[PDB]
């Protein structure tokens, strides 16, 4: 449907940013009242801020660390509002205090509502998959 | 607002229900359609699968695990939809493969929506907040 198109395009958009580290690219597809919470529970409030703060990271940690999508499973959860769960695979790379973190899967939610007939994102969250837990998932004994 | 108080009472029932060990209380406060992504990444499509999630982790490695608010960030996002930022203090406890998980601050991501008067979770996203990466939040900066 409109709102699963709409998200899937939204997300390419902003995995183009993110790999040509072009953050300028990112306020187009966020609206003002967005918000953010990444993978080490950083909280940023308003568009400025997840602008301020991807290009902060893009200059430093960042710089050469791609990100590419393995599935993106998106839904309209009620008209004009669009949910996708997405993985992805993160190059490693070094935090700012030297520790190394790994090549690993990411699961982001992203959600994108729509506006005067315009769909951009009002929230993302993140947070790394860890490998060692994913056998212990409940839900695996289901059925 | 009217999606700010209706989120504050689901979020409220839900915290009640972990630190009571009531799990048979969440299918009342998600929508069947409802998903989740929890701290180490894991997704579940669906209510029955959030549910039997939540269940087996209470009667396991969560049992003893109290999870208290300290803060919640809740807005409205589109008519009939609200969001909200929750920080918790979640306790200690073991994963089920062994490892020691310190007491830390969670960031979590709740999304309500309305239907025919009623709301309920549509979902939820968890991600534990590192105390020592903070210090490098860009928006200190700012």
Redesign the interface.
Known sequence: GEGTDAIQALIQAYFTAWNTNAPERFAEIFWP?G?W?????????GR??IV??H???LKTIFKDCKQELVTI?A?T??P??A?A?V?LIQDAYV???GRQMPRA???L?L?A???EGVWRF??G??????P???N????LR?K
């Open positions: 009242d918000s919470v990444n993978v080490v529970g950083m909280h940023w409030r400025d801020q301020f703060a290009t902060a990271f499973e839904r959860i009620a004009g509002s949910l769960v993985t935090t700012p205090d899967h990411d699961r939610t959600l509502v729509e506006r009002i929230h969250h993140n947070t790394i998959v860890n060692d837990a994913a212990n998932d409940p839900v289901m």
